[PDB]
């Protein structure tokens, strides 16, 4: 009757389907929320600037806040625009003037325009936005999302309360993953759990995206699949490949590299990045880590210029055999 | 010579003549074929993301699926567009805009678009295709081909079923080469065969294009003609050249090189890639292989850095900055 | 009946709320102001050129000169373009053809175009400007802003009344700090005051913007809050990181970088910028200072060109460990 | 009209005095007409500077209205095989002249293109019908022609034309073909041709192929070279300390004109000395331009890189 | 009915018209002449290896030898071939087979095959020659010509009598020239002769070719014409360009270079060779000559790789300005 | 016919005229020659493995072995192949089996196949040789040549009698040179002999060539002719030149190079070869010797690629003084 289990899990993004709906559902940002609640509890708040990584809270809170601030009106008093991609037409001109001119729904004191990826706007775009901002201050309240506050011109920055979102701890990312798992028919094995936490590195959205894609292959989330979904390899394999080289077993490490490459089908950059991570979890004297670190930097730049992936990766492993002889 | 033979033996691409038209006519991608058959046998499939090398199954598996799904109605329900060659993102979100606006043919529930070289798209481009993908999510199903899944933005990957195509085994490649050989009337010499395998190293397409090419020169497939069209020197020659130089006969290694570059007029990268390969077929101590591998990586970069004019030009402008303030 | 404390402070930029609105309200640069009062009480004034540090008197003085020569419409006879934020000497020349186009509002002898950072234009550009300055000379007067009168060409300078502003002392702007800090109800801690001073680097505007942003974070203007909003790290922390590297403590330097990166949430460019500034306050010989300073620029080039941030940033630390040894 | 015939082959000098800028050469050429005696001639230099103009202009004065036969014009870059160069000549310099002088002229355009052996064959052919015909070999560098042919030739080195010379000629074509030669466009055509008269005539035309009005824009547009002002700005930005914006402008240029690393590179080379900076800076830039031209060159010399690598094997070879 | 002198001067190359006919006429190769005379005087002669520069006596000697060995029969019994495959190694070993499979004319005991540029053959080729050499050793006698004996394989070298030709002293060259000047009614000025000798550096052929070229321009041989037809600028001029660049006048040096290039019409390599010849004749400190010699070597190699000449030449001049700042 | 002394000397290469005929003719391997004679005495031998450097006795002895075992029939029973020559050894494998097929001529018990450079065979290649070593062990006997026995697989080593040839010594080489001098009517002087020994440095083949070449100029072998025919300058001269450069006397070095070049007419490479050798005989610290040597190698590469000989020689001498004063 219905579609296949595969399409059922791929249709709607788990990232959205399970985004917390209230400032009390959000996690790991405890201090950030306390500040936000104060707003909703007193119907008073200035323009906001949410700085930090993607998938750690920002837009979840930008929505939750509006929700607890307008109840059933959030959707009629909250304009979500994405500066960068610019979803649609001139999503920064005639669109706003409309929303901005009308009034809030309910006894609401103001509206909210959530400009996501604001730091993607040129200095000029930000100048215009500065005016377009102070223009309807009385009616609209801005919530600017960005990677780095230092990428937003000061005129705009001085009119905002700065919030700095940081990565989330594993436990928190884990609780959410365990929940989505149970409430989806998944058999989240612990190996698969750890495999997701490690890669995700504190980015909730990222962990979810890996969890979902994983489930599409099978309801039993195994680490082997966590790795097949992300262009990732087993952290254990990457280390062996390096140690083998360091120890002096260049040919063998070339062998290992060949396997990881064939099994995972990941890119040179993918391997390089994993290499840069595992190198620091190696029983190697400090001085060798210094040399290793420099080499990874240099080879990363060679890849950027277009150098041959396999040739460069093998030349890097040989460098390891060289740094290993000391 | 061959009067008209060199007109019929090469008028139609043997890759688009002997290309499997049935999922079960595909070799090497077993577990992938299994999954694909399950789609045609349910009428439901989500968006597809095909990751791996070229000429190894990705496009024949797209067509062999359109066939088993649209019967003779494939040429009108299955569209193929190259993400790179195509003018741009817009032209892309355009051609599909008119294709996915009219229902299928033959009662098929949906039509299919095949975006080849999808990772060739910029991030912004992948943002456009993303929206367009969701826009026509009911009428059309997308099959995105890419060299690495890690070069496709997460929003799109979290909506596709991931498939990883690996290189075909030499066995299967030969099985099909003999076939095409018989039905085409060719003296498939044991030599010329091994050549094509050694050069193709897993790439079905590449192996065929070469086979057909050598045939276009002479009905009898000689490893001589293989290397000729293959634009690759004889491994024996490459190894000799490198071995001579290693012995200490630079002057002689250099003549050998000149000859090669003279005969088949290969390229710097051609020779380099062949040298990278043969380093591991030489009778030398591992430590020497370590060095040679490092050196070949280095000259690969020298070649790359040389042909990357923008990187050079910008490094120049930066030199100006350190100068214009001295 | 009142907004929360956070909203009161932010509502208007303190840099304006404490801006000498009149010529006779400026303190510190007396000799200069008096000369400016000669043009207000005479009606006649030539093209001008202000020389001095940022936020030391340049803008506040020019703005005041538009209130005593236009009345309350200091906005309909006073343009404001930034030579460095503008394309070139065309988009700028065009803006002067649309401003001087229509005679000054009311009975106004002429309008005024405050070109900020004029000495940021190339000399071929400073020519076109000199050409444009005169052509409209009649209806519009200019107030070219620069950092050094010497960075302005001859054709220009000879036509301007050179006003030079002296860098306000460090404990000088401190006055206009403890003031506003007490006039706005703030427990401006001594540390924090010093922290603002270190980052302000002689610019009052930046110093005010930092207090306002810091005050919005809490009543007590602390150092932890001056950095968090400034998007910078404690100079001691930067230097300690660089020093820790030079000494060969690579591993420790890494963690310092991680901490800074994690907590303060800085950007690679942010870090690289602070590294380049704290490298000269190092208990190190000048020769190493220049080398290190160039390495920072080398790795930034890599970043500008697409290299991986954490990989390169750490590679840079290793260069430090390596350069320390030599 | 419109574009019936290339201004070049149309407004080409017919007399040795119609030629300008190669005075030392013309004076020597008019000594041949004056005595009716002349040896094999060797013309070396760039294209569009006077070589063929003189070849024709000379043959006209040595044969008069009757010179269309006493002048077999050939082009060395012919069908791979000089076996066609001995039969076509076997009968040309076998048929003595009449009406003209005591000999015939065979203008072999681009003679420095022949291979060693081909040139040695031309040395016997040259000597074969020496009494009948007289050769006029045209080349880029006389150093490409074998000495046995250089010693038998009177050598003339055609230099690039000066601006004043080229300019006026363009004018005497504009004011007779319905054209407006403004100042922005003139200084433009000149700047790009760098003394090449054929080029400055193909640029004047192509730029007028949009309208008689020759604008500095129509000029750079038709041609490849980018706006000197742009290249110059980019460098000043860079020099001024604004690497980011310069990088930006560069992309522009490339994105616009669609040029190569070397074209842009030569253009930079040219404007460096045309910059408001002190001399010492020009020293450092000059050095830096050379360095990067070398990097680009080295990067593309696949033989040198490969042999450098084999030389390295030799090193690694010694255990 | 005569011809203009310019015409009578260019009818036949003087290197030929005046090439010595007898061994006794040959100059500056005393000892060699004697060895060869002993062959004609005894009818006994082995294979020969003539090593040395071009235009100093090798060919003349080979010919003069034939003339004395075969009288008028020298053209019949003496065959010259350019090893530099004036058609291809074999299609040259073929021409020697036809020529060798026949009896000598006039009743002489053997014929001569004079190989020009033997040292231009690869080792494989030189190995084939050694065979052909041994094959007809009884009928033919080979005279192999090379720049350096060390470039000919030992097997061949052992079967030959080595003759090491040297450059000719100026006196020797002067005589010949003044002789030809006498016989051609030219005015060889002291200066013109000094120029010719300077430029020829001992190569008789070269000297005579310059004389001839210059005579074609005027019975009066002036150094102005010598330099002009020899495509070399005068020493004093090259020295000026260097001293100009060396004292700080880079812009001037460039100009001078421009003049030389345009005036005399040299090449990039021509200027470098001249600079190398003249740099040691400058009133400069030894440490500077050391840095300049190193630079000329570096730039020579850049030209060898095909770098742009003007760009490299100006860049080299800039190096003179830098080195110039003691 | 009665040719002059010279023609008689160059009649045939002395290396071949005096090639050791019998095992007692061989010089310098006394112990080995003893084992070899034992085989001829008993008419039987196992497979052999010759190890050591080139031109020191391996082939010579192998041939001398075949001559004594087979007498006049050696050429029929002794086959010599080169392992490294893959293509040829395969396009001749048929001939080999043929040699191994037919019985030994003259009634001898077996034929010998001499595999030169047997250590250029891979592990599998060596495994296969072993197969055919046993296969025909009854009719043919193998003599494998290599640089190191350690490069031949244990299996194959187990089946052979190992012989380790060592370098020859001046004394062995000098005795043979004396024998030839006597058997040719030469006046071998001490200076001449020591000169030869010095130039040949352990190479018997080269030593004989130098002697023959010198005998062709005179019957009295002087150290003057030896250096000349060998195209080498006085070793003291090369050393003095380099020492002069190193002390900082670049100009004197240059003068010396001039004198040398004036006295002989060597090539850039001739000089570099000698420099490369004499640098190791300078009273210099070893690390310097390695620098200088590397440097000569670098400049030889420019020369081989077409650089200007004299310009590079001078640039090289400069590099010496730059290195010295450091
Ligand atoms: N504290 C959190 N609690 C629960 N889910 C979270 C939290 N932070 C992020 N997420 C998840 O990550 C996704 C990314 O949105 P968000 O956190 O606002 O970051 P961004 O600014 O990159 O959009 C959300 O859809 C949500 O599922
Ligand atoms: N020693 C010499 N005596 C007389 N003429 C010489 C001598 N050396 C060179 N020449 C002249 O230089 C020309 C070059 O020929 P030659 O000396 O044989 O050198 P190559 O073998 O390089 O051609 C000859 O035509 C001859 O006129
Ligand atoms: N003892 C010797 N007596 C005479 N000549 C020798 C002797 N040893 C080597 N040679 C010379 O060296 C050449 C090289 O052969 P050989 O010594 O067998 O070494 P390889 O194994 O490298 O071939 C011989 O042809 C011969 O000219």
UniProtKB/Swiss-Prot annotation, chains A, B, C, E, F:
It comes from the Archaea. Coiled coil: none annotated. Changing residue 305 to A: Decreases the stability of the PCNA-RFC complex and reduces the clamp-loading activity. This is Replication factor C small subunit, 2nd part. It comes from Pyrococcus furiosus (strain ATCC 43587 / DSM 3638 / JCM 8422 / Vc1). The lineage of its organism: Archaea, Methanobacteriati, Methanobacteriota, Thermococci, Thermococcales. The chain holds residues 585 to 852 of 852 of the full protein.
């Amino acid at each position: 009757s219905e579609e296949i289990r595969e399409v059922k899990v791929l249709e709607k993004p788990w990232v959205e389907k399970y985004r917390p709906q209230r400032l009390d559902d959000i996690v790991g940002q405890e201090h950030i929320v306390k500040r936000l609640k104060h707003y909703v509890k007193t119907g008073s708040m200035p323009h906001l600037l949410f700085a930090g990584p993607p998938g750690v809270g920002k837009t979840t809170a930008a929505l939750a806040l509006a929700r607890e601030l307008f109840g059933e009106n959030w959707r009629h008093n909250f304009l979500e625009l994405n500066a960068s991609d610019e979803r649609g037409i001139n999503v920064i001109r005639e669109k706003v003037k409309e929303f901005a001119r009308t009034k809030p729904i309910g006894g609401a004191s103001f509206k909210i325009i959530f400009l996501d990826e604001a730091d993607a706007l040129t200095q000029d775009a930000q100048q215009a936005l500065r005016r377009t901002m102070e223009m309807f201050s009385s009616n609209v309240r801005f919530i600017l999302s960005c990677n780095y506050s230092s990428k937003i011109i000061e005129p705009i920055q001085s009119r905002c309360a700065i919030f700095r979102f940081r990565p989330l701890r594993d436990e928190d990312i884990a609780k959410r993953l365990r929940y989505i798992a149970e409430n989806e028919g998944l058999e989240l094995t612990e190996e698969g759990l750890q495999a997701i936490l490690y890669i995700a590195e504190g980015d909730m959205r990222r962990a979810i995206n890996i969890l979902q894609a994983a489930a599409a292959l099978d309801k039993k989330i195994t680490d082997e699949n966590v790795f097949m979904v992300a262009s990732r390899a087993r952290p254990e394999d990457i280390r062996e490949m390096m140690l083998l080289a360091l120890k002096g077993n260049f040919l063998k490490a070339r062998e290992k590299l060949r396997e990881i490459l064939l099994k995972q089908g990941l890119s040179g950059e993918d391997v390089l990045v994993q290499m840069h991570k595992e190198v620091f979890n190696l029983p190697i004297e400090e001085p060798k880590k210094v040399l290793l670190a420099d080499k990874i930097g240099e080879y990363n730049f060679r890849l950027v210029e277009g150098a041959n992936e396999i040739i460069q990766l093998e030349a890097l492993l040989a460098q390891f055999t060289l740094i290993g002889k000391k």
